Amino acid sequence: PQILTHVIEGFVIQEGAEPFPVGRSSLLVGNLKGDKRIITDDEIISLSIEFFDQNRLDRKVNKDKEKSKEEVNDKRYLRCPAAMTVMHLRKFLRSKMDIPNTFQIDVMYEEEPLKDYYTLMDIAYIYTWRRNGPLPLKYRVRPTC
């Protein structure tokens, strides 16, 4: 639902409200197949992307304003070819949010921006992501000069 297509070089990625484990099969909670022997780049990586939480003032939305439907989740989700780079993502954001060249975009894992050559695999290997959930990315804009 609510999935949108954008092209970034070397593959087309579709991003939006990806189905959640809650609605997915409960069997996916158990010991799913996984193997560090697999180093292929013909692989799909699941991830999220949200605006770095600077405007949240270090406050939790659900904490201050708990919803009865529990609809607090400021991300967009992405099934993405693992070969894709930070450079591609920033472009995709640049295009999605219509971001002028007047600003820079930092793509970050936690607080730390990532180099534009990093592949999504490189990130999973660097940060030792364990395929528990999507790879959580963040982003932010800065004036350039």
Side-chain angles (χ1 to χ4, degrees), residues 33-47:
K33 183 177 179 180
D35 185 353
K36 292 180 180 179
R37 291 179 180 175
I38 300 171
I39 59 170
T40 60
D41 63 336
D42 321 305
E43 204 165 335
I44 289 300
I45 188 123
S46 150
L47 65 99

Side-chain angles (χ1 to χ4, degrees), residues 13-89:
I13 63 157
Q14 302 178 315
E15 185 178 287
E18 185 180 351
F20 296 86
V22 172
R24 296 179 193 196
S25 175
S26 68
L27 293 175
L28 297 172
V29 173
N31 187 0
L32 296 177
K33 183 177 179 180
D35 185 353
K36 292 180 180 179
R37 291 179 180 175
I38 300 171
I39 59 170
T40 60
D41 63 336
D42 321 305
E43 204 165 335
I44 289 300
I45 188 123
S46 150
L47 65 99
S48 56
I49 188 56
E50 73 198 312
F51 193 68
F52 182 101
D53 61 353
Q54 185 63 51
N55 291 329
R56 300 295 180 190
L57 304 178
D58 298 325
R59 294 165 61 183
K60 183 176 181 178
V61 172
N62 191 62
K63 181 177 179 180
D64 290 348
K65 296 181 180 179
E66 184 179 1
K67 295 184 182 182
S68 67
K69 295 181 179 179
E70 300 184 352
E71 296 181 357
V72 179
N73 186 10
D74 188 359
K75 298 168 171 56
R76 294 192 300 271
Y77 295 79
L78 186 53
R79 293 181 180 178
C80 190
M84 303 300 271
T85 65
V86 170
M87 178 186 70
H88 300 130
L89 288 174

Side-chain angles (χ1 to χ4, degrees), residues 49-52 86 89-90 93-94 99 103-115 137-143:
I49 188 56
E50 73 198 312
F51 193 68
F52 182 101
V86 170
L89 288 174
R90 169 182 311 119
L93 296 165
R94 179 143 252 138
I99 289 160
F103 283 98
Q104 287 271 118
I105 328 312
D106 296 326
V107 177
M108 311 169 277
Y109 180 71
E110 36 198 353
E111 317 288 293
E112 22 178 17
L114 311 171
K115 320 286 204 292
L137 300 194
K138 263 166 141 207
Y139 91 94
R140 145 186 92 160
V141 308
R142 286 183 305 136

Side-chain angles (χ1 to χ4, degrees), residues 115-127:
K115 320 286 204 292
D116 70 332
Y117 63 92
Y118 290 165
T119 210
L120 290 163
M121 307 166 168
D122 286 338
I123 302 173
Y125 182 88
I126 291 149
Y127 294 100

